[PDB]
């Protein structure tokens, strides 16, 4: 299932990057 | 190797989670 696992790891990075943007945006709001 | 080594490249992208922990500490 290496082809399926490649999609699964790719999904994990996509979710993490999507969440990573949120932390920086809220942190900037906290600075204000 | 195309669909069994490309998944390995996504493992390289896993380090971004470590950056997310560092930024999470700043949020706190």
């Amino acid at each position: 299932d290496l082809y399926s696992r490649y999609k699964k790891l790719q999904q994990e990075l996509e979710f993490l990057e999507v969440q990573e943007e949120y932390i920086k945006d809220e942190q900037k709001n906290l600075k204000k | 190797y195309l669909s069994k080594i490309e998944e390995l490249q996504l493992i390289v992208n896993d380090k971004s989670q470590n950056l997310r922990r560092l930024q999470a500490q700043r949020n706190e």
Binding site: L2 | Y1, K4, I5, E7, L8, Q9, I11, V12, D14, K15, N18, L19, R21, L22, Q25
Partner: protein, 447 residues
């Protein structure tokens, strides 16, 4: 009791090194490999300094369910070469610890290299390294696991590459090992990258040496990225050859800066016959520029032993006596030829005249043409005028020679007061230091 004590401490150190690497490899990624492997590599270097009992410890390193403590008792029980190299795999497969198996394969090779047989037995160690290399080839190519071995055992492969270089040094050279390194470069082209390729390529340049400078030119095209320079010593090694390439290529001015940067990055002692070679290239290239560098600033004692020639040669460059330079060249031709910078000395024999003109340019704002002829002992004033055209050269103040009454006007740059004329001059300098503010971003990222 005195012979067993070295064996007990070394075995305990190896056990701690194995345990730390294995535990980290089991948990997480990136932090899993090379977190302490570089520390383990320096510990391995200490083990190399501190010394057959090590092969018995290697024997049957792993069998199946973890029994390392029981295995340590078994190693003591043996107390109470080529067969030993393949003995642990033959006696029982590890059944796990794939990164550890490569480290376990590496541990016997270091004593074989320490023996320095310079014989077929050392080549047999090279064959054992080739077997270890095959495991490294399959670490990501056949095994679909994370690159713990690429992150850590590639450094082990680099040590094996250096051992392979030792075998070739005993014989001639192996371009095929460099081709294998090119295959490793293809692995570097993949998800993970290593800079060991440049160091072996430097050896390839070295093997061709004077006979071929194309390999150095090929190296310039081969130059890619890897600015991480995690070893740092590796960056100095890359810089030392890169500076050598420029010096032989007549780019002396760029080379001296590169050598100075390379000289700064020498954490290892490099006490005898080592750092002195890096120092030798920097001093010769500065002499080739014509600026005179006194040896008092650095003067490493080992640099000094090789510097009895260069130091007299530096005095000869200052002196106007060709015969003194000739005596230095004939008497001290040896050793400089061993350095391989002897060709640079041969070009330097013509360069002696340039040093005097540079001194004149700093000393006199508007020197007379006849005076230049007296200072450099030119046979005729017309020869001095010809020398003045050579004096303009490049990277010096505009001569702006009248060619008549003005003679060698050699007018210096004016309004160089760090004012409007140098406004670019003293603002550009700040931009570079302010650019180094990147260190605050890089370290902030690490947490």
């Amino acid at each position: 009791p005195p012979p067993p004590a070295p064996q007990d401490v070394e075995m305990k150190e190896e056990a701690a090194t194995g345990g730390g690497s294995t535990g980290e490899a089991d948990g997480k990624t990136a932090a899993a490999a090379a977190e302490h492997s570089q520390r383990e590599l320096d510990t391995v270097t200490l083990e190399d300094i501190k010394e057959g009992k090590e092969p018995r410890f290697v024997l049957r390193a792993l069998r199946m369910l973890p029994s390392t403590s029981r295995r340590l008792n078994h190693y003591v029980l043996y107390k109470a070469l080529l067969p030993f190299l393949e003995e642990p795999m033959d006696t029982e497969a590890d059944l796990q610890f794939r990164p550890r198996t490569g480290k376990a394969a590496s541990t016997p090779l270091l004593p074989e290299v320490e023996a320095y047989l310079q014989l077929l037995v050392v080549i047999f160690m090279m064959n054992s390294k080739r077997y270890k290399e095959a495991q490294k080839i399959s670490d990501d190519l056949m095994q679909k696991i994370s690159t713990q071995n690429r992150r850590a055992l590639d450094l082990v492969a680099a040590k094996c590459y250096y051992y392979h270089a030792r075998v070739y040094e005993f014989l001639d050279k192996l371009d095929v090992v460099r081709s294998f390194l090119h295959a490793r470069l293809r692995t570097a082209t993949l998800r993970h990258d290593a800079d060991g390729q440049a160091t072996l390529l430097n050896l390839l340049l070295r093997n061709y040496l004077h006979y071929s400078l194309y390999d150095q030119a090929e190296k310039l095209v081969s130059k890619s990225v890897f600015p991480e320079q995690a070893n740092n010593n590796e960056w100095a090694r890359y810089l030392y050859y890169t500076g050598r390439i420029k010096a032989i290529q007549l780019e002396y001015s760029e080379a001296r800066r590169t050598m100075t940067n390379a000289l700064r990055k020498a954490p290892q002692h490099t006490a005898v016959g080592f750092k002195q070679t890096v120092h030798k290239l920097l001093i010769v290239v500065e002499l080739l520029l014509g600026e005179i560098p006194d040896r008092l600033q650095f003067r490493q004692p080992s640099l000094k032993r090789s510097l009895m020639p260069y130091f007299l040669l530096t005095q000869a460059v200052r002196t106007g006596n060709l015969a003194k330079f000739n005596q230095v060249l004939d008497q001290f031709g040896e050793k400089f030829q061993a350095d391989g910078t002897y060709t640079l000395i041969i070009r330097l024999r013509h360069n002696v005249i340039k040093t005097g003109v540079r001194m004149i340019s700093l000393s006199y704002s508007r020197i007379s043409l006849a005076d230049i002829a007296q200072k450099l002992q030119l046979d005729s004033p017309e020869d001095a005028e010809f020398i003045v055209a050579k004096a303009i050269r490049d990277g010096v103040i505009e001569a702006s020679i009248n060619h008549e009454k003005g003679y060698v006007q050699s007018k210096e740059m004016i309004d160089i007061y760090s004012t409007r004329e140098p406004q670019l001059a003293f603002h550009q300098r700040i931009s570079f230091c302010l650019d180094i503010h990147n260190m605050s971003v890089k370290a902030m990222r690490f947490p």
